Design a protein around this ligand. Structure first.
Ligand SMILES: [Zn+2]
Ligand SMILES: [Zn+2]
Lengths: 353, 351
């Protein structure tokens, strides 16, 4: 008779007789009560910790409370425990259909003020709630420790190495995570490389940052809002060419006089601009058109393919999802370029085996 | 505010934050607590009679309590009610996979002492518990009000009608029952007629001699084979009547049968336990409807009558009367072995 364990047991049972499931917080003819403290009868099997102290007692209504202790013949503790477990496990099986634990991986090379990075990472658990997850306390940050080398030709190489090292330094907590929600925003080559480092570690949700709304990182639609298509800039394929230019024109339409002649394909979205991507479904459809209607088309049209030159103008989630889709030692080398200021499209980094 | 309603709310939620489902009766690092009185935070929208007093507040952990009121922008009360109803209704949907309500219909023309009839009907809700049901308070008894004319040539004629009236007198609560568990024991013609009166979630139970629960099943799986033996070379169209002999409890010898083509429906194991499970009864009814009645309807397109001579446990005639298809089947004349004289006509099933 300790009121704490009573409260816990009333909770595990949803306030019900563990045989007939009568609500013991409701009178048999009217409204409420002083409830399980009075109406309910706990049966103790045989004489603040809890290890199976909860797995000893069981709630009962009046009828079955008598019934089951005045016939220990038909109702052994053997059958009784079976009934207890088979009901409680059907109750707490609601986790299995509720929200799921999810860790958070954050990477922000664009926002520099530290008290603003914190200000903004304060919205991630809310987005997790809005996308059928909940924050399990583990947040992983990729260090922008090299903001000092931000314009040295070697920046990408070193930032890549840093990223790789950190990712591997948390690889075991990454593969063992229930779900990983990623909030990444950085130059498109580094986003691609982040997607490469991850590479479908079971359950990963890649989120997109918008300008508008209370939650910049939350989706703005839950359904497909764009068509993505391909336009090839070469009459038909051959077997001498080893390199192909692939131009992703989602955020803007990249004009060809910016591209350093080599066969080219252009992957467009119908609606171009800041909102080419509005839902996870948009990203899925983009990646489908990308792998099937673009990359595989390139591998077919060019069996002697040795390199793809990627020129992107895409929102943040798209390079990460492209870097996740890479098939190591089955795909070719992917050289990703980045528009440096004034200079045009300049090489940034590469994906290999 | 009052722990009066708090206990009910802790119950509807299974002791959990209605967003993240953290168990609020367990510490984040160790064992138990003083639990939801301390660890939990109820959010009230605005200020022991519960009609939606329960549908106002909601449980929260620390994190999400601090989170959801310091952000009424993303978290309006509309979204909160949506989450609350979804989770709460997702919780109490476990009855839908628990026990099922079941009413009780009792009929005992064999046991006569009144303090023994009640003594024995005190065991029915226990059988309901052991067969995935629970008693919903409604017990229906078919009255053996004619115990005094039990041997008058017309007894059956009257008893049937009595039963019929009683059935109609509760016909409306019978169609509306979640489940109806039947504990019937009487001469096989009356059991057949009871099954006919029912004709429909109905669980027909069998009484055994041995065990703590005479009426509970003794197996949950098939324990017998039922087969047919025909005593006529092939069918014709001149015959209008057929003798059907059900030899489950014993092997009815034919010199007791009042010549007419005959089929015999036997079980491998005959005796008091030819039927041991509901599955045995299902298999019997399958062999009966398909391998017997339809066989006769084929072999005899000018069929006009089936003569039933039974030796079956109590559940079998009731289930046969349940399986009767009115105005598709023919007349079923059911006989009962009366003392010395052999099988004497008892009653009939028609349209
Ligand atoms: Zn109960
Ligand atoms: Zn919570």
């Amino acid at each position: 008779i300790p009121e704490r364990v009573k409260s816990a047991l009333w909770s595990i049972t949803a306030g019900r007789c563990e045989i007939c499931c009568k609500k013991l917080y409701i009178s048999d003819v009217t409204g409420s009560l002083v409830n399980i403290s009075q109406m309910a009868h706990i049966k103790a099997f045989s004489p603040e910790n809890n290890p199976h102290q909860l797995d000893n007692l069981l709630l009962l209504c009046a009828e079955h409370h008598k019934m089951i202790d005045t016939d220990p013949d038909d109702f052994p503790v053997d059958w009784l425990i079976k009934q207890k477990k088979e009901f409680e496990e059907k109750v707490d099986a609601v986790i299995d259909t509720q929200r799921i634990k999810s860790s958070i991986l954050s990477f922000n090379s664009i926002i520099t003020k530290n008290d603003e990075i914190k200000n903004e990472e304060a919205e991630f658990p809310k987005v997790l709630l809005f996308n059928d997850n909940y924050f399990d306390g583990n947040i992983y940050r990729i260090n922008n420790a090299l903001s000092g080398i931000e314009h040295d030709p070697m920046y990408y190489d070193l930032m890549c190495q840093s990223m790789k090292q950190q990712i591997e330094k948390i690889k075991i907590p990454l593969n063992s995570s229930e779900t990983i929600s990623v909030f990444a925003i950085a130059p498109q080559p580094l986003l691609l490389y982040l997607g490469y480092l991850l590479n479908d570690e079971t359950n990963i949700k890649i989120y997109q940052r918008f300008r508008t709304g209370n939650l910049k990182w939350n989706w703005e639609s839950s359904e497909i809002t764009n068509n993505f298509y391909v336009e090839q800039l070469y009459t038909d394929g051959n077997e001498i060419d080893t390199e192909v230019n692939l131009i992703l024109s989602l955020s803007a339409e990249i004009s060809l006089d910016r591209i350093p002649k080599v066969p080219t394909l252009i992957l467009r979205s119908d609606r171009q601009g800041f909102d080419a991507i509005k839902s996870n479904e948009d990203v899925n459809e983009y990646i489908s058109v990308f792998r099937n209607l673009v990359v595989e088309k390139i591998r077919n049209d060019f069996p002697n393919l040795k390199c793809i030159n990627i020129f992107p103008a895409t929102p943040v989630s798209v390079p990460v999802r492209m870097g996740m889709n890479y098939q190591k030692n089955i795909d070719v080398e992917w050289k990703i370029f980045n528009q440096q200021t004034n200079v045009g499209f300049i090489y940034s980094l590469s994906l290999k085996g």
